[PDB]
């Protein structure tokens, strides 16, 4: 009867539709990146889109994820420049969760993506 | 003829519609929070919504901004828990930009929002 607790670094299937232009849309996996307190009590979560239309990480705001270890359709890339705040009503099901090493890559990609690295 | 550049810390009027549930929607001012390299060359920007339904920070992911200095309709709040990636076609017009001190608060609130602080 109780909630399934949403933790940072979890991967959920989410309905991002509809979108415009180069925004990632459709029903796709997303990784929770909001802090755990916000995830426990807020009506919204902050996610980063995952796409399988590309294979390599190319740019430093992208993070690759294996298909086997994280049980996806194919080798995919976390897009830390494709972020959105979703009402929890958009969450369909929990797919898996990212390892500690993989979430450190997501952390570093967010620092770059949002210009948070103290430069000098 | 050229387009004025988009810089982190700028405040743009942007069309966020449509949305669902507790997500911020409509056509409202938003703060550019993506790095400037992305803002110059990427087809998308990353923004944080500004709301007028509160005028005082409810949590440490909220940052207040006075209407007079930043040309708002009323005293508003930047919601660093309401961030989204927008195609630049949604950007309507640049309203203003935040001071260095105010962007420091935005940086700190974003660090809490996305669980990026040390530990």
């Amino acid at each position, epitope marked *: 009867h109780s909630q399934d607790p949403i933790r940072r670094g979890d991967v959920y299937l989410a309905d991002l539709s509809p979108v415009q*232009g*180069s925004e990632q849309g459709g029903v796709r996996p997303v990784v929770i990146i909001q802090n755990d307190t916000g995830n426990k009590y807020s009506p919204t979560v902050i996610v980063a889109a995952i796409t399988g*239309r*590309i294979n390599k990480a*190319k*740019i430093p705001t992208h993070v690759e994820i294996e298909k086997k270890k994280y049980k996806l359709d194919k080798d995919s890339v976390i897009l830390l420049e494709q972020i959105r705040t979703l009402d929890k009503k958009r969450l369909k099901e929990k797919l898996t969760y990212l390892s500690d090493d993989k979430m450190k890559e997501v952390d570093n990609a967010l620092m770059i993506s949002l210009g948070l690295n103290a430069v000098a | *003829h*050229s*387009q004025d550049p*988009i810089r982190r810390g700028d405040v*743009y009027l942007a069309d966020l519609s449509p949305v669902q549930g507790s997500e911020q929607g409509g056509v409202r001012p938003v703060v550019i929070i993506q790095n400037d390299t992305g803002n110059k*060359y*990427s*087809p998308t920007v990353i923004v944080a919504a500004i709301t007028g339904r509160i005028n005082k920070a409810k949590i440490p992911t909220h940052v207040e901004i006075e209407k007079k200095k930043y040309k708002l309709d009323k005293d508003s709040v930047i919601l660093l828990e309401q961030i989204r990636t927008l*195609d*630049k*076609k*949604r*950007l309507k*017009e640049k309203l203003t930009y935040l001071s260095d001190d105010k962007m420091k608060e935005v940086d700190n609130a974003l660090m809490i929002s996305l669980g990026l602080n040390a530990v």
Partner: nanobody, 130 residues
């Protein structure tokens, strides 16, 4: 009502040049950033070049930068692509595409798709072979 018609494609030898054009009508051409994207046989869409709604800002893919030049004349409601130093890898159908907004127009690094743009032309064929 809305139409983007390309012209100016053709057959050239390697090292030749071409001037593509794309005429707009049915919508406010000056309110839209314009793109050129090309598609080779059996390949996905490759973004080529971008120009903002006013014409002052241009962007190019690394594969064409320096060889191609995008421009626009909002009085004629026409977009141009000047192609020089053509090579066989440039053989493709070339589409113009529009996206509204004064701040649109940028460098595309992902694979592009038709729904990522507002309006699409019918394409013009470019073939580079001796």
């Amino acid at each position: 009502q809305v139409q983007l018609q390309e012209s100016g494609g053709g057959l050239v030898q390697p090292g030749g040049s071409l001037r593509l054009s794309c005429a707009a009508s049915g919508f406010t051409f000056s309110s839209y950033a314009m793109s050129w994207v090309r598609q080779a046989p059996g390949k996905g869409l490759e973004w080529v070049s971008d120009i903002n709604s006013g014409g002052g800002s241009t962007y190019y893919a690394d594969s064409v930068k320096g060889r191609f030049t995008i421009s626009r004349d909002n009085a004629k409601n026409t977009l141009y692509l000047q192609m020089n130093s053509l090579k066989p890898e440039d053989t493709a159908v070339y589409y113009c595409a529009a996206k509204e907004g004064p701040y649109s127009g940028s460098y595309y690094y992902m694979p592009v798709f038709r729904d990522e743009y507002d309006y699409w032309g019918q394409g013009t064929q470019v073939t580079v072979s001796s």
